[PDB]
Amino acid sequence: MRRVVVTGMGIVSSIGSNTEEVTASLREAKSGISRAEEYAELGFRCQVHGAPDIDIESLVDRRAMRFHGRGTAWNHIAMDQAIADAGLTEEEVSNERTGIIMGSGGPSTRTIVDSADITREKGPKRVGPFAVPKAMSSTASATLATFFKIKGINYSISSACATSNHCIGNAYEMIQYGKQDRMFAGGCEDLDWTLSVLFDAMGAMSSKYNDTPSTASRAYDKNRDGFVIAGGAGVLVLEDLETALARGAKIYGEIVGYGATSDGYDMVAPSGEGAIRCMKMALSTVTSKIDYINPHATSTPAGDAPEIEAIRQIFGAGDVCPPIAATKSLTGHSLGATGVQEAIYSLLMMQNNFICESAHIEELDPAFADMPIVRKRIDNVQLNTVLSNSFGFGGTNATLVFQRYQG
Amino acid sequence: MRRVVVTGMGIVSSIGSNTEEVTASLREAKSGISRAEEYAELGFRCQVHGAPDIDIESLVDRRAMRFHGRGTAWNHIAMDQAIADAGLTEEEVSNERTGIIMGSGGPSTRTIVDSADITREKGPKRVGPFAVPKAMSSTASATLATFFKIKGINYSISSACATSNHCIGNAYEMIQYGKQDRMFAGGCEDLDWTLSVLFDAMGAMSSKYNDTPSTASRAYDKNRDGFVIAGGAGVLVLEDLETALARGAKIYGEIVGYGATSDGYDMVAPSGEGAIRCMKMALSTVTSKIDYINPHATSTPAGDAPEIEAIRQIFGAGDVCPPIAATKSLTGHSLGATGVQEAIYSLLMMQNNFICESAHIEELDPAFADMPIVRKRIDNVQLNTVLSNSFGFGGTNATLVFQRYQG
Ligand SMILES: O=c1ccc2ccc(O)cc2o1
Ligand SMILES: O=c1ccc2ccc(O)cc2o1
Ligand SMILES: [Cl-]
Ligand SMILES: [Cl-]
Ligand SMILES: [Cl-]
Ligand SMILES: [Cl-]
Ligand code: NA
Ligand code: NA
Missing domain, CATH: 3.40.47.10 (Thiolase/Chalcone synthase)
Structure with missing residues (x-):
């Protein structure tokens, strides 16, 4: 290939x-x-x-x-x-x-x-x-x-x-x-x-x-x-x-x-296990650590949590997990446009050596207190590999991983 | 593969x-x-x-x-x-x-x-x-x-x-x-x-x-x-x-x-050359003659003709060209469903050893008088390889070829 x-x-x-x-x-x-x-x-x-x-x-x-x-x-x-x-x-x-x-x-x-x-x-x-x-x-x-x-x-x-x-x-x-x-x-x-x-x-x-x-x-x-x-x-x-x-x-x-899977579960809520399989499929061809996760996280009670659990299953919790920052807190959810826009945000953050704040977190959900959700912009960080999820109605999952080209 | x-x-x-x-x-x-x-x-x-x-x-x-x-x-x-x-x-x-x-x-x-x-x-x-x-x-x-x-x-x-x-x-x-x-x-x-x-x-x-x-x-x-x-x-x-x-x-x-190409020409009329490239791409992996063509032909002045010219370019005219029968004369055009339905019609004709009439031709367009458009059902014919076109608004072309499995 x-x-x-x-x-x-x-x-x-x-x-x-x-x-x-x-x-x-x-x-x-x-x-x-x-x-x-x-x-x-x-x-x-x-x-x-x-x-x-x-x-x-x-x-x-x-x-x-x-x-x-x-x-x-x-x-x-x-x-x-x-x-x-x-x-x-x-x-x-x-x-x-x-x-x-x-x-x-x-x-x-x-x-x-x-x-x-x-x-x-x-x-x-x-x-x-x-x-x-x-x-x-x-x-x-x-x-x-x-x-x-x-x-x-x-x-x-x-x-x-x-x-x-x-x-x-x-x-x-x-x-x-x-x-x-x-x-x-x-x-x-x-x-x-x-x-x-x-x-x-x-x-x-x-x-x-x-x-x-x-x-x-x-x-x-x-x-x-x-x-x-x-x-x-x-x-x-x-x-x-x-x-x-x-x-x-x-x-x-x-x-x-690139991962693509199907939950085969619920029309409007994720199963979680489908997302795990999707991220694993994307990661199966990747040989460097992930430096930043651009999640699906759309600011919903039922959606934000299962993805975090899927992330925890793959990457662990705390400092060993890649930093997570939900750009939808700034942008909203543009449906058809979301995946490509989030690819672009992630590539621009890679280009400019920063990870944005996961915005508008006035009180963090205690369920996520163990995770490296970015509370303040991280500067002067070299990002080499970034992962972005999108998980859609009908249990449809897609993950992309992009890497800084160094040969 | x-x-x-x-x-x-x-x-x-x-x-x-x-x-x-x-x-x-x-x-x-x-x-x-x-x-x-x-x-x-x-x-x-x-x-x-x-x-x-x-x-x-x-x-x-x-x-x-x-x-x-x-x-x-x-x-x-x-x-x-x-x-x-x-x-x-x-x-x-x-x-x-x-x-x-x-x-x-x-x-x-x-x-x-x-x-x-x-x-x-x-x-x-x-x-x-x-x-x-x-x-x-x-x-x-x-x-x-x-x-x-x-x-x-x-x-x-x-x-x-x-x-x-x-x-x-x-x-x-x-x-x-x-x-x-x-x-x-x-x-x-x-x-x-x-x-x-x-x-x-x-x-x-x-x-x-x-x-x-x-x-x-x-x-x-x-x-x-x-x-x-x-x-x-x-x-x-x-x-x-x-x-x-x-x-x-x-x-x-x-x-x-399987062929897939793009005309890059007109939104609602075909260019013809895109269809030629699409059929050639589908045929590039096929090593038997084509026994039947299920055309795109939707019963339109501007659509039926360029496809016939594309067919003529690839296969020639008259008896050396595969028989052509437009199933849309019976079925109409079901848009999203058309491609798969035409695959099914073609596979059923293969199974049953006949090619249907290209229906409702009361007076053939003289522009197509040289082509083997089926005027009466052909019986007791062994079909081994069938080709089906679908050519859509926005200059989007797809062709599939199916073959009788004999090992
Ligand atoms: O991403 C979506 C999900 C549902 C949906 C439903 C209707 C529509 O026009 C666009 C849509 O986009
Ligand atoms: O195949 C088509 C082409 C145009 C089109 C336009 C609107 C629609 O709802 C379905 C459609 O299907
Ligand atoms: Cl359901
Ligand atoms: Cl639009
Ligand atoms: Cl146009
Ligand atoms: Cl429907
Ligand atoms: Na994302
Ligand atoms: Na067809």
């Missing part, structure tokens, strides 16, 4: 519109969570969200927007960023050896609802002719593959919270096995009431911190009360090592492990 | 609720297309559809239905059928070596619209707590993985019309490379006005045959005027050859080729 490296990154996040803004937010523990006035107007319990702040029309031209919902428009921006970061020529983007696996947890729910509404109000013709590519589950891959003239692999993986972790892992496999030499991998999610309401109705999102929105997402806090939803996108450029070296690529890291 | 065989099949289709009914429909060219009265009531141009006729409540119990939209309920039925056909024990279904890649072109658009409607009419709580797994793009994998206690791989691929072809191809790869020994692969789609209207608004569906619905889908006919939408599901059980042989499995066929 060939070695696979990350040569470019792009991101649209609740904590920044590019990698520089994201890095500053991570370093300063600047929350991306704000009040969602619209959710209050609609009668939601949860009235907080993690909204990107970015001017799409200034970055994606009108004709290029024809088939984009707002999630895939963010993904287009992230792809432009990743291409620029990697320094790719047009020929390097568009060729038979270069593919795309780009996913979202759902499609444009807003397009679907707006279309149903206008059908009933003004008639089917008034849906317009461009709604299908926005409404389909493959929207993120179809729109970008077409626009960027991708000629190799083209499809989406979805797996709820795990979506863009599996997209990256499958793209990794394609390159390892020699089927493609370069891949664009990642994902996105729109942020829209038509999606958020589904989670509010199940009671899954935070509602006890509506008056202090910035601190509503608080993984590992004793009084965590649900996740905070977000939208955004991320893209990695992946290349086989020889391809990267030969063109003088930047190497942000090497992908050195 | 390991060899991979199909050991069980399940299907819910517009042309039958199991493989026996489907076989009878193929043999007798019995159309599955009917009038869609609801589409007329809503003001659609197209007023035809391919609707399954199956009693879900009699086949999936109430608690098992909690997280199913109607597409994934059909997929559950197809999975039960495939498990029974393969003769699998509970331990063979649920183990770390057995996974699922099961997709849909979209999620339950009906769940999304109903939820938005009830939010506005009665409040967010009245969405209920079970809508998320129905509305997410991974619905088909999440629901079945959880219910059937799947422990290995668990995710969905989506790629519009190509969805379940890529699901099968990626599952094939997993087994080839030794990561899993058994996979459930396939997909589904609900049939609902909230999805169909998106296609009617783009003018993509047939509307000149509303008064003769049964003949509205007519691939290769001079007067074809758009596809006919359908819903349903299909599942294949895939196993590495040694696993299959050792347990006395039925072998419906061996997967011997």
